[PDB]
Structure formats: structure tokens, C-alpha cells
């Protein structure tokens, strides 16, 4: 009849898993609490933003970022779980890059942050590989006809970040000013950095 299986409340199930393992001495003291802290506080799109702003103002670093993303990121100490082999992909006047994991949710956690709910949605996972222009449009990003859209499907161990184009009107801005306009969505590739009116 296609009905859902009977299930205890998810909170009760998740905590049961914790207690079953913790009760057997298999979880070190403060272990999950420490990961929670890392996930919430250390893994952050602010790091990706910093990298972009540096690339934007430092031709030498921009070249390193685009050729050996891992090395570039390591200089900041931002390698980590789900972010050990990094490739940065460069937007151009004729190319817009976008990242997905169609098979699950794979994301460069340490520099982009853990994926947002929408990135993990079946909608995004199913649609962006096939109709990225329509998907970005619906999300509020219009990509013109003269621009190739390239979708990177994160199917293995490469962990991607988009290096967006630096918008006009930011000439002479400091690294801190530039960082501010590079958001999580710019790093995933669904948004273009915005300069205020």
C-alpha cells in the first residue's frame, strides 16, 4: 500500500543510537560534543570567502588556488574532513560553474560549511544537473544565453569551491570588504556576489 513503516520518533532513535554505543564505552568523552562544535563553528563559508577575496587581490595566490587548490587552502590551515583534496573552479565572462552532489550531499565542508537543507533536497539533486539555468533562475540568479553553465557533480573525493567573478564597483576594496560579499551560495555557485547600491 506504499505506507511508511512504523517508527519511533527520530529524536528517540538518534539518542538511542548514541546511548547504545556510549553505554559500551565506544564513544570517547566529549566526542560528539566536540564534532558538534567543529561543525557549527569551524567549518564555515567565511573561510571560502576569505580565500576568494585573497584570490581577487593576489594574482599569485589566485593561480595557486586554481592549480593546486589543496595547497592554497592548506596555507590558511583550512583542510579538513570532506575537504582534503580541493579544486577551485573559475567563473569567467563566458562560464558559470555550479556544484552539486546528485548521489547524496558531498560538499567541501571546512571552507563552505556543512551543506544547507536545500542543497541536499531531491529537487536540487535531480534538477540542477539537467536544467541548471532554470534552477538558478528560480533561485534568483539569471544566467544569460552567452554564458556556458558547467555543473560539477561531486561523485568522488574532489571537493569543489566556485571562484566567482569579481563584480565591478569593488575596485580598491580591502580583503575584509570583499569577503563580506562572497556568501555560501556564491561558493556553491548558485549566486553571484552582489555590490550594494
Amino acid at each position: 500500500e506504499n505506507a511508511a513503516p512504523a517508527q519511533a520518533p527520530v529524536s528517540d532513535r538518534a539518542w538511542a543510537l548514541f546511548r547504545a554505543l556510549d553505554g559500551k564505552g565506544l564513544v570517547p568523552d566529549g566526542y560528539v560534543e566536540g564534532w558538534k562544535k567543529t561543525f557549527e563553528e569551524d567549518f564555515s563559508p567565511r573561510r571560502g570567502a576569505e580565500l576568494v577575496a585573497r584570490a581577487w587581490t593576489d594574482p599569485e595566490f589566485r593561480q595557486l588556488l586554481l592549480t593546486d587548490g589543496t595547497a592554497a587552502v592548506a596555507q590558511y590551515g583550512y583542510l579538513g574532513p570532506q575537504g582534503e583534496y580541493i579544486v577551485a573552479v573559475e567563473d569567467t565572462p563566458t562560464l558559470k560553474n555550479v556544484i552539486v552532489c546528485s548521489l547524496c550531499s558531498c560538499t567541501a565542508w571546512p571552507i563552505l560549511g556543512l551543506p544547507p537543507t536545500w542543497y541536499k533536497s531531491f529537487e536540487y539533486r535531480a534538477r540542477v544537473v539537467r536544467e541548471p539555468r532554470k534552477v538558478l533562475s528560480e533561485m534568483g540568479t539569471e544566467i544569460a544565453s552567452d554564458i556556458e553553465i558547467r555543473v560539477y557533480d561531486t561523485t568522488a573525493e574532489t571537493r569543489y569551491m566556485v571562484l566567482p567573478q569579481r563584480p565591478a564597483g569593488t575596485e580598491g576594496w580591502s580583503q575584509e570588504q570583499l569577503q563580506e560579499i562572497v556568501t555560501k551560495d556564491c561558493l556553491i555557485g548558485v549566486a553571484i556576489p552582489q555590490v550594494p547600491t
Binding site: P5, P28, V32, F39, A126, M139, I149, T155
Partner: protein, 212 residues
């Protein structure tokens, strides 16, 4: 595994539930949500009970309707619990006792996996390759939309990793292979029924062969 998880190209879904730069809230929206990833890492790094690939595969093994109605983080609670039972670390009965009710798990594997391929080719940037026209019932990191399709190498990784089709089943013969960024034209994958330009899939060497 040609499971419902292989969603790329599926038609009929509605709008992505986001507009750019909208508030996505806190990292975790409930007090339990950090547990699946945390306990996965306990399993991988502390217990050495399973690999990350086994976690992807156990989630692929959720009964299909179960998969489709289950929120993301809950799929991982179910997956990690399944692995813990399968590896003999926990019992389903103790999980259900502790949970105070039913704790259905992923379905048993129907494949023992397969070894890293014996015969592969080192490809170079610019080379044309075809994704091997093979069907794998167990874990595979090839989404079906690219099976048998032809693309061009844009990158060969400078590092190598165990073949997922083996380590995703906890086998001893996963070896190590680099992966390749293979760029496909959108029309190669979806004919006229796409609005995109190109798609780049990150494919293990063993999934590839020289193009004709």
C-alpha cells in the same frame, strides 16, 4: 546500484526550496542532528568498524519508499545504526528497547561488491573517454546519466583512493586509483532536453575506457 538515490536527471520535481542568500537557519535544526555525522566518524576513526563508502552504500540500501520519505539527517541515523548492527557492534533489539519503539533499518546488501578493476588506463588531460557500459548492483560512484557516454578529461587527480565498489562493501581488494574530471556536453547526457552547457563528473579510473 540503480537505486532511487540516483536522482540526477529525474523529472517531475518542483522548485528548490531556497532563493539565493536566504536565511538557512542554524547548522542543526534539532538537538539530535549532529549525531549521525559524529557517530559515523566514531565508527570510521575510533572503532574502525566501517568506511565512509560503506555509509554511502548503507543509505543507498534503505528500502526505496523509506528513502524517499526520510529527511537527510535521519537517513544517516538509520544508515549508521544499520552498519553498527551489521558489524555486530549493536543489536536491533537494543536499539528498539532504547528508542522505545520500531527502528527499521536499511535492507541487507544484495551484492558482495567487486574488486578494483585489474585492467585500467592512465588517461591524460584532453583525452576522450567513455564511461564503461557496466551494471553494478552494489555500491558505485557513477551516476547512471553518464553510463556509456563520452566526455573529455579535464583533470587527473594527483592522489589515489580505494575503489568505492570494493571499500563500500568493506572488501580487502579496493586497491587505489586516481579519479578523473570528465566533462560531458549537456546534449551528450540529455539530448535536446536540457538547458545547461556541460557537466563534469568525477570518475574513478576503473569506470572509464578509451573512446572509439
Amino acid at each position: 546500484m540503480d537505486g532511487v538515490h540516483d536522482l540526477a536527471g529525474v523529472q517531475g520535481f518542483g522548485k528548490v526550496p531556497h532563493t539565493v542568500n536566504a536565511d538557512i537557519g542554524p547548522t542543526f535544526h534539532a538537538e539530535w542532528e549532529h549525531l549521525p555525522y559524529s557517530l559515523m566518524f566514531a565508527g570510521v576513526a575510533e572503532l574502525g568498524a566501517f568506511s565512509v563508502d560503506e555509509v554511502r552504500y548503507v543509505v543507498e540500501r534503505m528500502e526505496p519508499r523509506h528513502y524517499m520519505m526520510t529527511p537527510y539527517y535521519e537517513r544517516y541515523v538509520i544508515g549508521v545504526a544499520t552498519l553498527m548492527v551489521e558489524k555486530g557492534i549493536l543489536t536491533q533489539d537494543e536499539l528498539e528497547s532504547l528508542a522505545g519503539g520500531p527502528f527499521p533499518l536499511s535492507r541487507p546488501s544484495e551484492s558482495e561488491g567487486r574488486p578494483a578493476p585489474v585492467e585500467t588506463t592512465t588517461f591524460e588531460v584532453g583525452q576522450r573517454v567513455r564511461v564503461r557500459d557496466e551494471y553494478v548492483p552494489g555500491h558505485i560512484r557513477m551516476p547512471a546519466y553518464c553510463r556509456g557516454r563520452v566526455g573529455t578529461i579535464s583533470h587527473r587527480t594527483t592522489e589515489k583512493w580505494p575503489f568505492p565498489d570494493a571499500i563500500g562493501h568493506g572488501r580487502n581488494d579496493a586497491g587505489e586509483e586516481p579519479t578523473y574530471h570528465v566533462k560531458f556536453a549537456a546534449e551528450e547526457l540529455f539530448g535536446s532536453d536540457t538547458d545547461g552547457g556541460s557537466v563534469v563528473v568525477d570518475l574513478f579510473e576503473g569506470y572509464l575506457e578509451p573512446a572509439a
